[PDB]
């Protein structure tokens, strides 16, 4: 088969600047008809892919002029000039010369924005959940940048291990931030054996860790 290689798993860019995304093939994609059968696609979070460039260097209908493609028969570049915050997503090359058609592994576009520390919120378990015998404590880290953020849980000032789970959103297409939830799961019985619940947050935008806590019983 023809192997498609995208050497960078992500590339960062400030809005208004230009960025290049690279792809290579293990065989020339040039056909005797003169066209090079390299296609570029964008996939935004939660959407189907969409074509940007067809046959290496041609702008697909309705795609903004800021997208352009160039290359040899084996090395290709998608250039995005005047990048917009809404350009976040994964960019894939694909060869359409020979069966089986094959895709590159994808290159995420990371939008650079001003560093922003998370706003941190903490939620005790609801009374409804406690009636069912389980307790979920939720710590929300909202609208921060960059993506890297560490959350540690302390119950009665004992650092927790093994009982939390985190989820992170994709980079927002408008404000270029991320949000993160950390959920600490205990039984109702174990939850009532303790008074102080705290999440401690480390992030580049913070000079020292931020702690949000509550005491069981308001």
């Amino acid at each position: 088969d023809i192997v498609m290689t995208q050497a960078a798993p992500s590339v960062p860019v400030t809005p208004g600047e230009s960025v290049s995304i690279s792809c290579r093939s293990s065989k020339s994609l040039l056909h005797s008809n003169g066209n090079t059968y390299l296609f570029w696609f964008l996939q935004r979070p939660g959407q189907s892919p969409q074509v940007l460039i067809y046959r290496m260097s041609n702008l697909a209908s309705g795609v903004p002029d800021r997208f352009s493609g160039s290359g040899s028969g084996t090395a290709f570049t998608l250039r995005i000039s005047r990048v917009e915050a809404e350009d976040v997503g994964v960019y894939y090359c694909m060869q359409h010369l020979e069966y089986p058609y094959t895709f590159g592994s994808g290159t995420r576009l990371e939008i650079k924005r001003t560093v922003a520390a998370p706003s941190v919120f903490i939620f005790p378990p609801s009374d409804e959940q406690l009636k069912s015998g389980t307790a979920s404590v939720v710590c929300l880290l909202n609208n921060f940048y960059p993506r890297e953020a560490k959350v540690q849980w302390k119950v009665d000032n004992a650092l927790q291990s093994g009982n939390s789970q985190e989820s992170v959103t994709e980079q927002d297409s408008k404000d270029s931030t991320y949000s993160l939830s950390s959920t600490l799961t205990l039984s109702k019985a174990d939850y009532e054996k303790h008074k102080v619940y705290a999440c401690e947050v480390t992030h580049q935008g913070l000079s020292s860790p931020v702690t949000k806590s509550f005491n069981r019983g308001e």
């Binding site: 892919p49 409804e128 989820s167």
Partner: protein
């Protein structure tokens, strides 16, 4: 306006087969090729094969030649992909696309599992002083213990979208999924605006509209 409309999500047992469909509208179905693409959750794209609906001719990625069968029904303008001998390796979103990849279906999620469907509980993440800063309050809903994916969440029947973050689900150690959806709003609105999270888990026919009350 061209559309490729794929069939709905499938939960299917290992060792069985499943057929997904791709119905074309807005153009002459038999004049264009249909291609099929696999995308594992959080991963890249893999090409399965292509069919010419006018001739019935097909070509398959050799990796899928034993797994996949592509057919087309001219009378209904529908292309079909059958996946046989299912294993968890086949759990993925499957796309159809018209030849060249300008027009794509919305995808069909296929989950291959022997586990039973379970509907979630929905619990409020109530706004309090511990979730209120500088005139902004955070609130949300915890959608706990469901299988399989997916769950959808809206707020106020879709009227509230600004400031909403619905998190990717996590697979808990129990083998059930959980997710949360949060929203930041003006703290001055907590006494005057009703906030409801609309949760839908289609596999269990669970539909919950949970009002999230300040505490």
């Amino acid at each position: 306006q061209v559309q490729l409309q794929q069939s709905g999500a499938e939960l299917v047992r290992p060792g069985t087969s499943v057929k997904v469909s791709c119905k074309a509208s807005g153009y002459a179905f038999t004049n264009y090729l249909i291609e099929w693409i696999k995308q594992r959750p959080g991963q890249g794209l893999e090409w399965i094969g292509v069919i010419n609906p006018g001739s019935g001719g097909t070509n398959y990625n050799e990796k899928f030649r034993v797994k996949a069968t592509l057919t087309a029904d001219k009378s209904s303008s529908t292309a079909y992909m059958q996946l046989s001998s299912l294993t968890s390796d086949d759990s993925a979103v499957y796309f159809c696309a018209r030849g060249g990849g300008y027009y794509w279906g919305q995808g069909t999620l296929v989950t291959v599992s022997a586990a039973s469907t379970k509907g979630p509980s929905v619990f409020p993440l109530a706004p309090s002083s511990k979730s209120t800063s500088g005139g902004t309050a955070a609130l949300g809903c915890l959608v706990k213990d469901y299988f399989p994916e997916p769950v959808t969440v809206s707020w106020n029947s879709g009227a509230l979208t600004s400031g909403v973050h619905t998190f990717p689900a996590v697979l808990q150690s129990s083998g059930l999924y959980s997710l949360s959806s949060v929203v930041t709003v003006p703290s001055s609105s907590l006494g005057t605006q009703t906030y409801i999270c609309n949760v839908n888990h289609k596999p269990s026919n669970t539909k919950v509209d949970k009002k999230v009350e300040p505490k």
